Amino acid sequence: ERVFQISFFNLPTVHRIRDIRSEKIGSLLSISGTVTRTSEVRPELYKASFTCDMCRAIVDNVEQSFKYTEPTFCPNPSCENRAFWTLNVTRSRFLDWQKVRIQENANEIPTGSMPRTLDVILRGDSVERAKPGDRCKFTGVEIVVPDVTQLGLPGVKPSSTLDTRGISKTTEGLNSGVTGLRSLGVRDLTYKISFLACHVISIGERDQEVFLNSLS
Amino acid sequence: ILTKEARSYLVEKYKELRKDDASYRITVRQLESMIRLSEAIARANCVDEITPSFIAEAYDLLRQSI
Amino acid sequence: DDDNTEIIKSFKNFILEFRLDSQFIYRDQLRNNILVKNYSLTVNMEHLIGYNEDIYKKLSDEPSDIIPLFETAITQVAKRISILNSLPTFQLILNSNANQIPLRDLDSEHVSKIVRLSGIIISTSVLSSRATYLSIMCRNCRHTTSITINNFNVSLPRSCLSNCGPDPYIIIHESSKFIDQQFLKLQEIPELVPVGEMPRNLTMTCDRYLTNKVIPGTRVTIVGIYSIYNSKGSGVAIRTPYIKILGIQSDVETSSIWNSVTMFTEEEEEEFLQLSRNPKLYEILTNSIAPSIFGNEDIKKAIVCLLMGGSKKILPDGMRLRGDINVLLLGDPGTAKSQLLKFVEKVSPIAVYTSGKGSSAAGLTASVQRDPMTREFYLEGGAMVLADGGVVCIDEFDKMRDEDRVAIHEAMEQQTISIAKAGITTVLNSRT
Amino acid sequence: ELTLESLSNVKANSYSEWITQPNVSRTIARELKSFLLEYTDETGRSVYGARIRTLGEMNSESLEVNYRHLAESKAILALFLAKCPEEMLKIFDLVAMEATELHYPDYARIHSEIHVRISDFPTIYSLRELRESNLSSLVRVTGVVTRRTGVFPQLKYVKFNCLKCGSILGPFFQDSNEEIRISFCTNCKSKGPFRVNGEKTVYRNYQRVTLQEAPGTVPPGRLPRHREVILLADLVDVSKPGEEVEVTGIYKNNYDGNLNAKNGFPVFATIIEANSIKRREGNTANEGEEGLDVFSWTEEEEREFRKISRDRGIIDKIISSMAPSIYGHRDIKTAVACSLFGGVPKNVNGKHSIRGDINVLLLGDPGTAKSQILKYVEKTAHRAVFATGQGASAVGLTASVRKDPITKEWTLEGGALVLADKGVCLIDEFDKMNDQDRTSIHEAMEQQSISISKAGIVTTLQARCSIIAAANPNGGRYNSTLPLAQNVSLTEPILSRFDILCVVRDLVDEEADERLATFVVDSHVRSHPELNARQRRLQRQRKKEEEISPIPQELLMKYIHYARTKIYPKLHQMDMDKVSRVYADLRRESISTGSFPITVRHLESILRIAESFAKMRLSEFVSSYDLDRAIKVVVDSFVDAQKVSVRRQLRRSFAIYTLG
Numbered sequence A: 001e002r003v004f005q006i007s008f009f010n011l012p013t014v015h016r017i018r019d020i021r022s023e024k025i026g027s028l029l030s031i032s033g034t035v036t037r038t039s040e041v042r043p044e045l046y047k048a049s050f051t052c053d054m055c056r057a058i059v060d061n062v063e064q065s066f067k068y069t070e071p072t073f074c075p076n077p078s079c080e081n082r083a084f085w086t087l088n089v090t091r092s093r094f095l096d097w098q099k100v101r102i103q104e105n106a107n108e109i110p111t112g113s114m115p116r117t118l119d120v121i122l123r124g125d126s127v128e129r130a131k132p133g134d135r136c137k138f139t140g141v142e143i144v145v146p147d148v149t150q151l152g153l154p155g156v157k158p159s160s161t162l163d164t165r166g167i168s169k170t171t172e173g174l175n176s177g178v179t180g181l182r183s184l185g186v187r188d189l190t191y192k193i194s195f196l197a198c199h200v201i202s203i204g205e206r207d208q209e210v211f212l213n214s215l216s
Numbered sequence B: 001i002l003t004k005e006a007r008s009y010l011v012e013k014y015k016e017l018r019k020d021d022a023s024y025r026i027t028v029r030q031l032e033s034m035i036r037l038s039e040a041i042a043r044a045n046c047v048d049e050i051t052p053s054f055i056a057e058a059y060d061l062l063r064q065s066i
Numbered sequence C: 001d002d003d004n005t006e007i008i009k010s011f012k013n014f015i016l017e018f019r020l021d022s023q024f025i026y027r028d029q030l031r032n033n034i035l036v037k038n039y040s041l042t043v044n045m046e047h048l049i050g051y052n053e054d055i056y057k058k059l060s061d062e063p064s065d066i067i068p069l070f071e072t073a074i075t076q077v078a079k080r081i082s083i084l085n086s087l088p089t090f091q092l093i094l095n096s097n098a099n100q101i102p103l104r105d106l107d108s109e110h111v112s113k114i115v116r117l118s119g120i121i122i123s124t125s126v127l128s129s130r131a132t133y134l135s136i137m138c139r140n141c142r143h144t145t146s147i148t149i150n151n152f153n154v155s156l157p158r159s160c161l162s163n164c165g166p167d168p169y170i171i172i173h174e175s176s177k178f179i180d181q182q183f184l185k186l187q188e189i190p191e192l193v194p195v196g197e198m199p200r201n202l203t204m205t206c207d208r209y210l211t212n213k214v215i216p217g218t219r220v221t222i223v224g225i226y227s228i229y230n231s232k233g234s235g236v237a238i239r240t241p242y243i244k245i246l247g248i249q250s251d252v253e254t255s256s257i258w259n260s261v262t263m264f265t266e267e268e269e270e271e272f273l274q275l276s277r278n279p280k281l282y283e284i285l286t287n288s289i290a291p292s293i294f295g296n297e298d299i300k301k302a303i304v305c306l307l308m309g310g311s312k313k314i315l316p317d318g319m320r321l322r323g324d325i326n327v328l329l330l331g332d333p334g335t336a337k338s339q340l341l342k343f344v345e346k347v348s349p350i351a352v353y354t355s356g357k358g359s360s361a362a363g364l365t366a367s368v369q370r371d372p373m374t375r376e377f378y379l380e381g382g383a384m385v386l387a388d389g390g391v392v393c394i395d396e397f398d399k400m401r402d403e404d405r406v407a408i409h410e411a412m413e414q415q416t417i418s419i420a421k422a423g424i425t426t427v428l429n430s431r432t
Numbered sequence D: 001e002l003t004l005e006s007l008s009n010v011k012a013n014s015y016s017e018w019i020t021q022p023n024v025s026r027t028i029a030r031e032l033k034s035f036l037l038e039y040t041d042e043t044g045r046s047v048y049g050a051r052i053r054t055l056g057e058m059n060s061e062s063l064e065v066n067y068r069h070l071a072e073s074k075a076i077l078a079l080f081l082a083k084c085p086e087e088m089l090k091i092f093d094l095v096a097m098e099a100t101e102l103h104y105p106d107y108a109r110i111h112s113e114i115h116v117r118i119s120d121f122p123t124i125y126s127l128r129e130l131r132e133s134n135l136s137s138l139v140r141v142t143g144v145v146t147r148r149t150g151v152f153p154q155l156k157y158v159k160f161n162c163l164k165c166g167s168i169l170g171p172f173f174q175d176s177n178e179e180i181r182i183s184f185c186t187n188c189k190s191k192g193p194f195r196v197n198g199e200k201t202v203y204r205n206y207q208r209v210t211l212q213e214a215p216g217t218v219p220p221g222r223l224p225r226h227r228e229v230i231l232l233a234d235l236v237d238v239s240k241p242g243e244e245v246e247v248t249g250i251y252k253n254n255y256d257g258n259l260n261a262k263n264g265f266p267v268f269a270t271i272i273e274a275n276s277i278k279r280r281e282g283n284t285a286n287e288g289e290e291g292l293d294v295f296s297w298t299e300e301e302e303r304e305f306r307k308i309s310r311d312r313g314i315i316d317k318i319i320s321s322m323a324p325s326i327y328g329h330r331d332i333k334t335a336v337a338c339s340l341f342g343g344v345p346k347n348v349n350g351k352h353s354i355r356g357d358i359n360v361l362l363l364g365d366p367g368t369a370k371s372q373i374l375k376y377v378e379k380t381a382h383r384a385v386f387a388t389g390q391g392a393s394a395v396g397l398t399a400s401v402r403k404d405p406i407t408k409e410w411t412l413e414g415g416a417l418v419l420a421d422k423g424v425c426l427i428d429e430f431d432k433m434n435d436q437d438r439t440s441i442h443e444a445m446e447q448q449s450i451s452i453s454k455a456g457i458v459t460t461l462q463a464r465c466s467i468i469a470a471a472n473p474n475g476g477r478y479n480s481t482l483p484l485a486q487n488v489s490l491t492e493p494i495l496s497r498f499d500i501l502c503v504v505r506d507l508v509d510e511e512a513d514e515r516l517a518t519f520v521v522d523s524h525v526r527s528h529p530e531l532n533a534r535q536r537r538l539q540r541q542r543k544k545e546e547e548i549s550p551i552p553q554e555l556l557m558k559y560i561h562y563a564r565t566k567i568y569p570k571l572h573q574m575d576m577d578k579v580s581r582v583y584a585d586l587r588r589e590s591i592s593t594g595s596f597p598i599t600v601r602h603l604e605s606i607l608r609i610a611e612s613f614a615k616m617r618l619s620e621f622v623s624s625y626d627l628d629r630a631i632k633v634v635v636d637s638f639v640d641a642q643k644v645s646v647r648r649q650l651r652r653s654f655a656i657y658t659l660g
């Protein structure tokens, strides 16, 4: 089946990057900004499929939110199993994924200002439609992204937040992190605001036979 | 494309220009540029064949700048 | 154990029953080595093939497993022919005449097989310690134990012998025995590198009586085993190859420290003194310098004088006088100036050939580098450090940059290099 | 059993499962074997039988199969190979080995498996346009090699041992990108420690490389993209750091924890397992031609070489075929041909090395097609490098020293003269160049080596390269009333290293101008862009080559490569007195009246040119005609670089030697 997408446009009012508050999280918005960095078109895991190690039973359509999620309770028999699955990478569905960095326009920047930034996520057919240096108007939903490293990623590769640079001492303990959840353990979960975009617009052949076709 | 008489007119004009120069300023590149100008002038008139009048116009344009 | 005993017996019979003409060569070599405190034995593979082909076939397919059995056979024979016991396990050194394999032809087909190859030494590491006899004690019950290790690639037992912990055992460092380990780096012969490829390097390990035997820049021939060790590079299940040295042949007679002693048997000394008495030795030596170059007799005489060198004197007041000769050739193109420089490189026992265009002061005298692991600064040698006690041939000398050329002033006359960089202040010797 | 008609209908809703079924995989193997055995081209000769015959001779481990051949007949198998490479390749390797064991029985003692290399895949992608729809499919991607890991052994059949049950597990085929994961015992019935089963195992050669996008492909002003490529056994060390390559392979995906941790979404890593490699460094003939190497020959082509090599006047046709569309300048063409074929290097008793390559210099007036000749030489040469003027540096034409990003040790990197080892380096506008950059090639031009002493690295490299240079005279134009030394800025040390010097003069002449203009206009007329049609294209493109080329260019490239690779002529019987007299006369007539430096270095160029002319004929011995022709070339190269006052006397004085 074709994973469908719905693209909204022509919203009444447009927002700037400095109007982004947490009270619009989950709402449909439109924003404007200048693109300054784009990444590769990576494949994102959409509908996962696994096989039980012992039964060989097949599970399909396991939704994933922000981290690699395997199924829990086994399928149709008596077999008891909490883990040890094998992803069937061939059966699983994937999608295109891209991350772009944008900053404020030259006019919205005050007289003395260090420009604010944001992370916009393009997915599906909207990849590569924003090029660095251009001025583009995005529209989508404002979301919040947690730190998955302290959410217990399967591999040892995360290695509990390995770092190369020193974090800010000013916001050490000032950034309010929630605790209590069993998956976290004694850890503290943190959040940051990002944007997810569904529609992108920009606001800033010598063959005779094919040429005659286009014109009215 | 180039016709039969166009080639003869082109070689005659190149020979005349080389004679008038005397090799200090005129080379093969001038003949190639004259061919290019003739083709462009032909593209202007929306014609797929080149007439010696076009070569005469290109020759006049080359002479006006030397 | 029912096959190892027969293998040891076969080796001991080989040692004790091999004879050519009227002399047991391998029985006599052991006794001669024991007298001068050399605990080793050198065996030629052709003799082993001639004696019995099954014994050779056993060794050729399982070297790391068979070689220690020959090692213990040698020391069993030694205690019989020397004693009616501070004799350590002997060493086996092998000689081969098989075809030489290039470094770039070594691959997965040659794992766990004895190979023969040649290359250039570029670096020698420092000596390290490896344990052979380990005295062991437990942390709780506290009883003595011992372990014996051979260096042909072990850990302390993950248990207890007689509650004690998982693997409780500590090493009693006194009453433990150790040997000498060294690491060397190899490189391809410059003329055997394929087209458009840069030369590649390889790692070798030597033990005991094969340490301090080569110096950087030497051309050698190596007989050893091609093996791999798992370590550490994002590849899956990949290993790093290296070579364990079994035999070394070196062109330069000089050892690591160049003992300044004679390494010449009387059969060669007689030849040399007979040569020295030739009334026309000067002409013979002159004619031997580049026989493919016409004329230029005085330059060849000067080259001979440079090769022999003068005398060096030390005075009571600490003065040092230079005893080396420097030569400059400033001439017209096409006069064979650059075909003599490369000949002097070949003839000289120690010599380096460099170009003035592609050079620098750090590369010529000495450099200072940072160790990725220790993160400190150490000194690394250069062209004038490698070519110590030899000759350096600098071509295109007029094209040198004026900053790089002035760094040679002290080395040319005072024969020392002074470094005062990054907390390191030393003076290194350089007699070239 | 099934039939080729029955493979059209598919079941299991997936092509991979349809292919891997036992009944389908028996028809596929038979059809592939029939294709291997029974395919014939237009001339009626089976090509794959000849390739298999050559495979055993060369002790090769790989077979090259063209995609067009397998698509023209049995197109369903072509589609299956296009969509599902991994399962098709396992079967096709087995059938290839079975076909190989019909010409060389007992070949399993040399090599145990035969690998298949696919060629001429129709669709070519760029690294920028790779998406998720290309996952697990065969792709063709062009790029530039940047960094190479090096060769390490890798496990092939992985084994495990469990201690409490002492169980030995069956061999496992490693994915080469994912570690073999086993936790269940067939005997122990529970979790147990697993060893690697030390010793008694089979290894393969493994290497990894990074491909960036080529600067030409990248849009102007945008950042390039890169990907990772895994090279298995028989494919290691083929590509070198700095070259531009085209790789056919399989596009795969894998799960990475760090990628999911940093980005924050369940994204996957991608990598390409290389199947075929084709070099495109210096090649502009990629517009046509079929295969992985267009400089390699077959048996019938070698027989045709030996057939056309015994015709009288082969040298004249070879010279006439150099740059056919350029009119005149036959001495330049002769010098270019002599440089292209080359001489023979020598070593006397292992202590005296003699160079065997010819260097050429072109000094001429503007507008005389020197650069076009350099471009033609770049196209025809097997290995070619191009540089111009101020765009090259001292270490850009030589070896440079860089800190390795991984090992963090000073290392050597290549340059223009090293990339063109056993090739040709071309330097356009050789007089508009810094002296410090120009003087870097002094060692490489004669000694054919590069010596570096920097940062603890003391090494000597090898650059067996030939140099063809083009320059402009002082004032832009040549004064025929002055000697050479006052028409150029170069001194004797660099002028002596050149073998052939061609002075190109533009003079006023009505008939010559008329002929040149007629030729140029006809050339522009010819080059205007306005059974199977794909062979009608070939015959039409051959008809245009008929007029101005005695032999086709594709044949000539393989001819030059074969001649350089195989032939090594000698100089047993020759006239020493004539050469000695010529050298003495040339030396005498230089200091007396001349400004062209002649040393012993010019005596050897005559012998090199004689050996080159011998190579042109595919002969193993130099004759008298070749030596006389070399003497004539050298004499004509010296007489025509004089003043107009003494040229007539010098030509008459030197005319006795070139009687023929």
Ligand SMILES: Nc1ncnc2c1ncn2[C@@H]1O[C@H](COP(=O)(O)OP(=O)(O)OP(=O)(O)O)[C@@H](O)[C@H]1O
Residues within 6 Å of the ligand: C292, C293, C294, C295, C331, C332, C333, C334, C335, C336, C337, C338, C339, C340, D354, D355, D446, D447, D493, D600, D601
């Ligand atoms: N006297 C000679 N005998 C034999 N060969 C000679 C003689 N003089 C020159 N040659 C030959 O001339 C060629 C070039 O000589 P070489 O490379 O040594 O020049 P050079 O003196 O270093 O020149 P440059 O000053 O240009 O660097 C070599 O092939 C060399 O064998």
Ligand SMILES: Nc1ncnc2c1ncn2[C@@H]1O[C@H](COP(=O)(O)OP(=O)(O)OP(=O)(O)O)[C@@H](O)[C@H]1O
Residues within 6 Å of the ligand: B028, B029, B032, D325, D326, D327, D328, D365, D366, D367, D368, D369, D370, D371, D372, D373, D428, D429, D470, D516, D520
């Ligand atoms: N017989 C010919 N002689 C000269 N030029 C020719 C000839 N036939 C064609 N041409 C054309 O004349 C033009 C001049 O050639 P080109 O650009 O190589 O000259 P150049 O002065 O040698 O170049 P450069 O300064 O780049 O080295 C080219 O377009 C070439 O194709």
Ligand SMILES: [Mg+2]
Residues within 6 Å of the ligand: C337, C338
């Ligand atoms: Mg020289």
Ligand SMILES: [Zn+2]
Residues within 6 Å of the ligand: A052, A053, A054, A055, A056, A057, A074, A075, A079, A080, A081
């Ligand atoms: Zn189950």
Ligand SMILES: [Zn+2]
Residues within 6 Å of the ligand: C138, C139, C140, C141, C142, C160, C161, C164, C168
């Ligand atoms: Zn204990």
Ligand SMILES: [Zn+2]
Residues within 6 Å of the ligand: D162, D163, D164, D165, D166, D167, D185, D187, D188, D189, D190, D191, D192
């Ligand atoms: Zn078990």
